Design a protein around this ligand. Structure first.
Ligand SMILES: CCCCCCCCCCCCCCCCCC(=O)OC[C@H](COP(=O)([O-])OCC(O)COP(=O)([O-])OC[C@@H](COC(=O)CCCCCCCCCCCCCCCCC)OC(=O)CCCCCCCCCCCCCCCCC)OC(=O)CCCCCCCCCCCCCCCCC
Ligand SMILES: CCCCCCCCCCCCCCCCCC(=O)OC[C@H](COP(=O)([O-])OCC(O)COP(=O)([O-])OC[C@@H](COC(=O)CCCCCCCCCCCCCCCCC)OC(=O)CCCCCCCCCCCCCCCCC)OC(=O)CCCCCCCCCCCCCCCCC
Ligand SMILES: CCCCCCCCCCCCCCCCCC(=O)OC[C@H](COP(=O)([O-])OCC(O)COP(=O)([O-])OC[C@@H](COC(=O)CCCCCCCCCCCCCCCCC)OC(=O)CCCCCCCCCCCCCCCCC)OC(=O)CCCCCCCCCCCCCCCCC
Ligand code: BCL
Ligand code: BCL
Ligand SMILES: CC[C@H]1c2cc3[nH]c4c(c3C)C(=O)[C@H](C(=O)OC)c4c3nc(cc4[nH]c(cc(n2)[C@@H]1C)c(C(C)=O)c4C)[C@@H](C)[C@@H]3CCC(=O)OC/C=C(\C)CCC[C@@H](C)CCC[C@@H](C)CCCC(C)C
Ligand SMILES: COC1=C(OC)C(=O)C(C/C=C(\C)CC/C=C(\C)CC/C=C(\C)CC/C=C(\C)CC/C=C(\C)CC/C=C(\C)CC/C=C(\C)CC/C=C(\C)CC/C=C(\C)CCC=C(C)C)=C(C)C1=O
Ligand SMILES: CCCCCCCCCCCCO[C@@H]1O[C@H](CO)[C@@H](O[C@H]2O[C@H](CO)[C@@H](O)[C@H](O)[C@H]2O)[C@H](O)[C@H]1O
Ligand SMILES: CCCCCCCCCCCCO[C@@H]1O[C@H](CO)[C@@H](O[C@H]2O[C@H](CO)[C@@H](O)[C@H](O)[C@H]2O)[C@H](O)[C@H]1O
Ligand SMILES: [Fe+3]
Lengths: 276, 251, 46, 299, 46, 48, 46, 47, 46, 47, 46, 47, 46, 46, 47
């Protein structure tokens, strides 16, 4: 079915590949060629995860884990029962994410709007690819990718962080955390501001963007405006993710694996301004 | 439960949260259904009973406006339900084909909503989108280029007209529209700033959505120094139609 | 964007003529620096 | 072209703002215009209304900051050179464990206690200021209740969990790298905070707020050519921009929000991040002392 | 003397003065209460 | 900075405020007498 | 002294007075309850 | 003349001086009592 | 010298002067209290 | 021009100077008393 | 010589000069205080 | 350009230089006293 | 005349020059004060 | 004669270039100080 | 270009040069005095 206003927009055309073969909707969802491909990749991946779990000890959802290959295989294809399932789930996942971004591009073209959403999703895709492809390749073996498990990839994060002393002292990581915390702050501020203007105090009319500008001024000191806030939010989230990716690229390929991020900062303490 | 029991305060708190969060997701998904409902059933579906979904849409919400006025959402009068479209195939989910001219019909990327035919009044009960000749005290800040005077050119390289005036938003100092004296019919049409490259690439401002002659067909505003919400959607929709239906033979 | 055109051409014409003299004074500095301590030793040493 | 920057920026008079209810004082009159601010957003840099609660909030906060800084200077023998050298490593450390919840000597946590008291009073006064600035314009108080969640996490970190543990020594220090080390040692001392479920939930809601604000910013910038950034007007009188946004997300993932309920989603994700965080912190030590053991007990 | 009020608002200066005095009093009481000699509640430590 | 009426409320408000402040102070003084009978404070330089 | 009520708004003065008094009482009760001599619940330590 | 009259200035200043002086007297009594309880300002070798 | 007030409005000037003088006094009292010789509370150490 | 008169500036300046001076005499009495309680500026060897 | 003030606002230039001078004085005093020889409180060390 | 004409410009500058000089001379006597208390700038081996 | 002042308003291209010169003088003094030879306060170590 | 500064406003680009040049000179000087052979202060170690 | 003209920058730059030169000359005097206190730039043998 359609929203009460949707029929105007469900027009033909705007696809990238395939013509009108897949130019249709299934309920709410637009399909396109990339929608078929995305469901294909997602389902092959989920079935490989289920099979890897069937080979494993437990079905416990928290303990399910698809582990990367042993370091003995380096950057080569591992046997399916000794890490190859991880590589194939990774290929299926990157395929799913890419075809999902492309389906979003097709929807953008069909609606006649900008491509900001697929572009922004490409940043999360890039962070994932950094984690499972770029960083283990730079470090020489697929064993550096994280295991696909709800609580085993947390163990991977813990071990990876503690292998560099304390990961908090990673500078790009500090920048990324600052960006994430500011993104959460700005999301709360923006949501609350719009909800305050739309749902005012009792007996009050719905407030205007001028009131929003005034209260934003009184809080943050100045005003960015209705388009500035969405720009700033996009920028904050994207830069958080980009600096997370940089953070991961510089630890292991650049700073040695058994290195120390706390000790890297001694370059400042050891400046000739104050060292001797 | 007791120190040795399998049940403990942490997981009880977690299940309390799971209940609260399921309730909150239901509430949020319910708030999401204040526009666009009930659903329009497609081909091969019985239309006797309404399609709504598992969180049913809430009761219509009533907003109070400044001048004692009142707006109840959903805005069902904005839907434009029946338009100039025909199904490209009899099965459900098939796309539609514009029967006529999608620039005039307002279909596809060229669709608009039946908004109120009245301008936005902002705060001092005056239209906020006005020509600079009507908003005294504001100025284009010559730090950036000045659009006025530059003749606007289509997408196929044909000059469409000349930029005559810059329309700005009050209380949010921002240029929203360029007024364009059309080529040779003595008519002024609006051009949304995001649909124009006002940079002076060579000498002029360029719009790649429609071609040069199509500037004659841009929906004109009824007044001269104020534009209504309906005309705003109509103009932005005329320009959005070109993103799919113009492609001005530039191959 | 940026600025006007003749502005840009004079910006280049002054930018390069300051960059050149900066390199000149850097070179005359390195000369007597090397006089004080010659760098770039051989695998033998200094 | 896309709306990451403003091509043509118009400039006009300075806006004094909406007149207030008869319960406030005359605001400042700075009202200056910065060019780059207008490049990325709006350009006005005022006028900041600073009433009683704002002034007392800044006074208490600067008392706290003065205490912290003077303690970091004293801990380094007043050397400004050594202060610049060691700055990120300096901190006003919390009281010693031997003192419990008493008022310890100044050099053993009394200064920390006084700085924490004054910082808490500053933050509560700033919260009251947000509440009044919203309700002096007739608006809702959603921003204030979003701020109250961050305040609840901050109180749990510095006050509530130290209370329930019976010792001010549990609380963070006032320093950059030292409070990072406090975070690390807090995770290490109480098992592994990855097995705190409310920590997992707080991370879920932080990632989700980043995801949601990327999605929403990108969506509004994508339909800004149709007037999408005027969200209040698009909610009161739905235009084609918000229709296109709703349709993008409905065709992408099967469901969409409205112009107002998307901001409820945003508010609730951003608020639930520190709410679940505060719960998980209050549980860590008074209720659960080893989170990995708890996780093994469950999964 | 009395002319300090022809330029200072009493409603403003007076409330700022009261806030300042209470903050100073709290600080002094806290400093005394942290020392062992001037603690009047569990007075001397050790 | 005049704010509110003048001796139309200020004097009666001051009357009520003073009597309430006085009731508060009296209750507090009784409370402190009882607290000193329970536990004296201000010990000697050597303790209690 | 009643003239102070020409300067101060009685409403906001009264709300500030109440919040202030309650905060002071809470602070003092907490300080006494954290010490050993004046803890009236479970009494002294040791 | 920023805010106040000139007679109200004198009246407010009179009340201000009386209240400030009463505050100072109460504080001086409090400090005499406090010194009688605990002298501060020890000798350079302690108390 | 009185001309200093022809361009400095006595309100802002005097309020920030008071803030600065109080800040300096606090800093000096804090420094003295940190030393062991001039610690008028708790006396010298050892 | 500070939105303020000229003879009015004379008056404010006179009051400012007398306040500043009473402050400095109180501070000088304070420092004499503090030196008598404990001198500073020791010798290179100490006190 | 004197032509400066036609370009710099004294209301701001003088304030910045005074903040800078106070900051420099504080820095120098603290540097002396950190030394063992020029410390005038607690005097030399060891 | 600042909102100042030439007359107040020069007379302000005169007051500036004279108070600047008074500040310098009192700083100079301060340094003389500080040197009498403890000379700085030791020789290559110390004091 | 030099039109770098035309690109850079001296109202800001002179206060930045001064903050930079101050930073540089501070850095050089700190460097000298950290050396054992060029320290003029507690001058030579060892 | 090259004219291309139309994307980077020469003020921002130039101030960033200058801060980079200054940072670079600082880096090189500090590296030289860190060495033993090229240390013009405190001379060569051991 | 910002909002100034050649009317000021014709000799503003001149007074800037004179001030910068006074700075340089007093600085070289300072360097001479510092060299007299302690020379720098030793030779690899030491000082
Ligand atoms: C793990 C293995 C895989 C499991 C998958 C999930 C299994 C359960 C769901 C299975 C559904 C099967 C449906 C088969 C077709 C039925 C016939 C049909 O098409 O009729 C038209 C029928 C309804 O048409 P309509 O009546 O016009 O729609 C409007 C509604 O009636 C009323 O309007 P409305 O606005 O109220 O609702 C609109 C919207 C309702 O909103 C959604 O669809 C939201 C979907 C996502 C929800 C969020 C999931 C979050 C999960 C987090 C889990 C974390 C756990 C761990 C935590 C640690 O869509 C729907 O009505 C429901 C569509 C199906 C939802 C599920 C889609 C797959 C989710 C996979 C996860 O359309 C559909 O059902 C859609 C078919 C296409 C989607 C299904 C295929 C998805 C493949 C995903 C692969 C990758 C998975 C990962
Ligand atoms: C559990 C499983 C079962 C439930 C499952 C389902 C859960 C979800 C259901 C749907 C929720 C829908 C929703 O969010 O609607 C929002 C929606 C927002 O308003 P709107 O409809 O958009 O427009 C309203 C107008 O614009 C007029 O707006 P306005 O000017 O009134 O301001 C609107 C503003 C506020 O709306 C209000 O109603 C709040 C203000 C009410 C009046 C003032 C009362 C002040 C009380 C202070 C108490 C402090 C602690 C508060 C703890 C709250 C939670 C217990 O709206 C909000 O903030 C949204 C609601 C969420 C607030 C979250 C607050 C987080 C606090 C974080 C900790 C703070 C610690 C203290 C920090 C203090 C500062 C330093 O409606 C409401 O907020 C109404 C519901 C309010 C609920 C209050 C709490 C009720 C439950 C009490 C506890 C019961 C359990 C324990 C019993 C005792 C055991 C011993
Ligand atoms: C051996 C035993 C005996 C055997 C039989 C023996 C005899 C044999 C012969 C006779 C019997 C055989 C033939 C039977 C034919 C039946 C045909 C039929 O029912 O067609 C329906 C109908 C046929 O088309 P239609 O005639 O156009 O339908 C008109 C209706 O009035 C629908 O009108 P509407 O569009 O207004 O209503 C739509 C509504 C229809 O659904 C509902 O009304 C309720 C849907 C939500 C239910 C929520 C859960 C409630 C229960 C919780 C308990 C556990 C749940 C499952 C947990 C699994 C894991 C433990 O769905 C929604 O609103 C969208 C739901 C979106 C869900 C999003 C999240 C999904 C993934 C979550 C996990 C990740 O097609 C559908 O309903 C398509 C959607 C189906 C999926 C619905 C949602 C699934 C939710 C999964 C669980 C999520 C929460 C956990
Ligand atoms: C030695 C310790 C003694 C003791 C010695 C004394 C002495 C001495 C005194 C008191 C006094 C009081 N004691 Mg006692 N008292 C003891 C034990 C207690 C216990 C207890 C549980 O054991 C309680 C509840 C109390 C309570 C009280 C109050 C009746 C009274 C404090 C006045 C006041 O709060 O002003 C507050 C006044 C108001 C008007 C506040 C009004 C409320 C405002 C509006 C709150 C604002 C909103 C608020 C912040 C919202 C909170 C929401 C939260 C999020 C939940 N005492 C022990 C046994 N007590 C004092 C007294 O009697 O004064 C007359 C007093 O002098
Ligand atoms: C080794 C470190 C541990 C770890 C130890 C902790 C500890 C301890 C905590 C967290 C907390 C959090 N962790 Mg963790 N965390 C780990 C790994 C992670 C990873 C990861 C990828 O591995 C992520 C994404 C996170 C993310 C998070 C957040 C979801 C959560 C912080 C919520 C928040 O928004 O605070 C931001 C908001 C605040 C900090 C409060 C707001 C402050 C106030 C309101 C503002 C005052 C400003 C003041 C006025 C300014 C002037 C002050 C003066 C200058 C002093 N952690 C590992 C396992 N983590 C916090 C939490 O809630 O978890 C339950 C927490 O306490
Ligand atoms: C939804 C949860 C998120 C959130 C929300 C949130 N924060 C908020 C608000 C909201 C809704 C406000 O309304 C309020 C505000 O005014 O925002 C502009 C605020 C605020 N959150 C702030 C900070 C802040 N929020 C943080 C986190 C979060 N805030 C969460 C992620 C953090 C982190 C991650 O550490 C910080 C540091 C302030 C900007 C402001 C509250 C200001 C306040 O209480 O002022 C008290 C006054 C003083 C202490 C005097 C001195 C003031 C200056 C020191 C201000 C400096 C601000 C900032 C640059 C500090 C950064 C850290 C420093 C160590 C450098
Ligand atoms: C490698 O990372 C690092 C950085 O670099 C990328 C950093 O910058 C910093 C260094 C940054 C700082 C230390 C800045 C924070 C310092 C303060 C806010 C304290 C202020 C400085 C003082 C204590 C000096 C005292 C002066 C006062 C109180 C008056 C103010 C003086 C002026 C106005 C300036 C004139 C002198 C660190 C530590 C670092 O590790
Ligand atoms: C029509 C389609 C035809 C498809 C043809 C297939 C082409 C071959 C696909 C590329 C496969 C290369 O496969 C893999 O490549 C890497 C990248 O260098 C090789 O090289 C790697 O060797 C070792 C591990 O083996 C790593 O530690 C090392 O860092 C890396 O050089 C691997 O040893 C090899 O196993
Ligand atoms: C502002 C936020 C809300 C207001 C504060 C919220 C909490 C209010 C109620 C606090 C109740 C006191 O809570 C109670 O604290 C006491 C001491 O403080 C703890 O008592 C014990 O804690 C631990 C237990 O190992 C030890 O330090 C010690 O044996 C003892 O102090 C209790 O375990 C806790 O239950
Ligand atoms: Fe928004």
């Amino acid at each position: 079915a359609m929203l009460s206003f949707e029929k105007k927009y469900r027009v033909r055309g705007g696809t990238l590949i395939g013509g009108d073969l897949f130019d249709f909707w299934v309920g709410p969802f637009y399909v396109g060629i990339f929608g078929v491909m995305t469901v294909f990749f997602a389902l092959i991946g989920i079935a490989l995860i289920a099979w890897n779990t069937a080979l494993g000890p437990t079905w416990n959802l928290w303990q399910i884990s698809v582990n990367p290959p042993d370091a003995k295989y380096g950057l080569g294809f591992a046997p399916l029962a000794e890490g190859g399932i991880w590589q194939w789930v990774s290929i299926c996942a990157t395929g799913a994410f890419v075809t999902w971004a492309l389906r979003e591009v097709e929807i953008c073209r069909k609606l006649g709007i900008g491509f900001h959403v697929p572009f922004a999703f490409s940043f999360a895709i890039f962070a994932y690819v950094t984690l499972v492809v770029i960083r283990p390749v730079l470090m020489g073996s697929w064993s550096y990718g994280f295991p696909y498990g709800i609580f085993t990839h947390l163990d991977w994060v813990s071990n990876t962080g503690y292998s560099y002393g304390q990961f908090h002292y990673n500078p790009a990581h500090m920048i990324a955390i600052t960006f994430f915390f500011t993104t959460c702050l700005a999301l709360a501020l923006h949501g609350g501001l719009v909800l305050s203007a739309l749902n005012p105090d009792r007996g009050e009319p719905v407030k205007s963007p001028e009131h929003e500008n005034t209260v934003f001024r009184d809080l943050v000191g100045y005003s960015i405006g209705t388009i500035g806030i969405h720009r700033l939010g996009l920028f904050l989230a994207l830069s958080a993710v980009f600096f997370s990716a940089v953070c991961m690229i510089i630890s292991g390929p650049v700073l040695a694996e058994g290195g120390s991020w706390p000790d890297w900062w001694n370059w400042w303490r050891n400046l000739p301004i104050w060292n001797p | 439960m007791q120190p040795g029991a399998y049940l403990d305060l942490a997981q009880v708190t977690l299940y309390v949260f799971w209940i609260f969060f399921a309730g909150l997701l239901f509430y949020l998904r319910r708030e999401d259904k204040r526009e666009g409902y009930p659903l329009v059933a497609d081909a091969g579906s019985g239309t006797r009973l309404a399609k709504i979904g598992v969180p049913a849409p809430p009761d219509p919400k009533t907003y109070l406006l400044r001048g004692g006025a009142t707006k109840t959402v959903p805005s069902t009068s904005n839907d434009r339900p029946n338009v100039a479209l025909t199904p490209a195939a009899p099965w459900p989910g098939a796309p539609f084909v514009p029967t006529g001219n999608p620039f005039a019909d307002g279909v596809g990327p060229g669709s608009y909503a039946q908004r109120a035919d009245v301008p936005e009044l902002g705060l001092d009960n005056l239209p906020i989108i006005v020509p600079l000749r009507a908003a005294k005290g504001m100025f284009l800040d010559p730090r950036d280029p000045n659009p006025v005077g530059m003749p606007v050119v289509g997408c196929d390289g044909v000059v469409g007209g000349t930029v005559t005036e810059v329309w700005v938003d009050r209380a949010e100092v921002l240029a929203r529209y360029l007024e364009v004296e059309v080529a040779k019919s003595r008519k002024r049409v609006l051009l949304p700033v995001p649909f124009a490259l006002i940079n002076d690439p060579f000498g002029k401002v360029s719009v790649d959505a429609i071609r040069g002659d199509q500037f004659a067909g841009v929906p004109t505003t009824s007044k001269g120094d104020q534009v209504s919400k309906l005309e705003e959607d109509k103009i932005c929709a005329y320009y959005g139609a070109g993103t799919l239906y113009a492609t001005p033979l530039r191959s | 964007s940026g600025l006007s055109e003749a502005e840009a051409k004079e910006f280049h014409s002054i930018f390069v003529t300051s960059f050149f003299l900066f390199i000149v004074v850097a070179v005359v500095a390195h000369i007597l620096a090397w006089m004080w301590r010659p760098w770039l030793p051989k695998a033998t040493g200094y | 072209y896309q709306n990451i920057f403003t091509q043509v920026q118009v400039e006009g008079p300075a806006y004094a703002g909406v007149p207030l209810r008869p319960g406030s004082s005359p605001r400042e009159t700075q009202t200056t215009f910065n060019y780059w601010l207008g490049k990325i957003g709006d350009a006005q840099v005022g006028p900041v209304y600073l009433g009683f609660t704002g002034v007392c909030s800044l006074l208490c906060g600067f008392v706290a900051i003065e205490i912290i800084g003077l303690n970091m200077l004293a801990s380094v023998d007043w050397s400004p050179i050594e202060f610049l050298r060691q700055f990120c490593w300096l901190a006003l450390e919390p009281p010693k464990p031997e003192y419990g919840l008493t008022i310890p000597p100044l050099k053993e946590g009394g200064w920390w206690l006084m700085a924490g008291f004054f910082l808490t009073v500053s933050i509560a006064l700033w919260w009251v200021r947000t509440y009044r600035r919203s309700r002096a314009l007739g608006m809702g108080t959603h921003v204030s209740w979003a701020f109250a969640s961050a305040i609840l996490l901050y109180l749990a970190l510095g006050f509530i969990q130290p209370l329930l543990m019976g010792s001010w020594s549990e609380a963070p220090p006032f320093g950059v790298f030292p409070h990072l080390d406090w975070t690390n040692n807090f995770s290490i001392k109480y098992g592994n905070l990855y097995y705190n479920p409310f920590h997992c939930l707080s991370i879920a809601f932080l990632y989700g707020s980043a995801l949601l604000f990327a999605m929403h910013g990108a969506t509004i910038l994508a339909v800004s050519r149709y007037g999408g950034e005027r969200e209040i007007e698009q909610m009161l009188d739905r235009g084609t921009a918000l229709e296109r946004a709703a349709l993008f997300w409905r065709w992408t993932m099967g469901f969409n929000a409205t112009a107002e309920s998307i901001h409820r989603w945003a508010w609730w994700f951003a608020v639930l991040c520190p709410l679940t965080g505060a719960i998980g912190i209050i549980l860590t030590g008074p209720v659960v002392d080893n989170w990995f053991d708890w996780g093994v007990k469950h999964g | 003397m009395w002319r300090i009020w022809l330029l200072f608002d009493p409603r403003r200066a007076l409330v700022l003065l009261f806030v300042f005095l209470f903050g100073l009093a709290i600080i002094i009481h806290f400093i005394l209460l942290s020392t062992s000699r001037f603690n009047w509640l569990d007075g001397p430590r050790a």
